[PDB]
Amino acid sequence: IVCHTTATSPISAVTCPPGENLCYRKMWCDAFCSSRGKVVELGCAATCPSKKPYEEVTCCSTDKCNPHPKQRPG
């Protein structure tokens, strides 16, 4: 499948290398840790890379299901 890259490029669903059997949604806090909370460095990953502490990672297998919740006027 494909996954969006928020860490690398700007944000585009581009197939990943051999390993990521799905996508994911990482979270932490930009270098500015704005009031927007954490970030959304989605992408590809073998499996829910979710950590435990902050490293709040997710998953996404659907076609471009890495479109974190942000695309909205607010």
Binding site: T6, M27, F32, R36, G37, H68, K70, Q71, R72
Partner: peptide, 14 residues
């Protein structure tokens, strides 16, 4: 310019 959890555009996100 960022992909936070409140926007996707580098105008609304940052």
């Amino acid at each position: 310019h960022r992909y936070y959890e409140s926007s996707l555009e580098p105008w609304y996100p940052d």
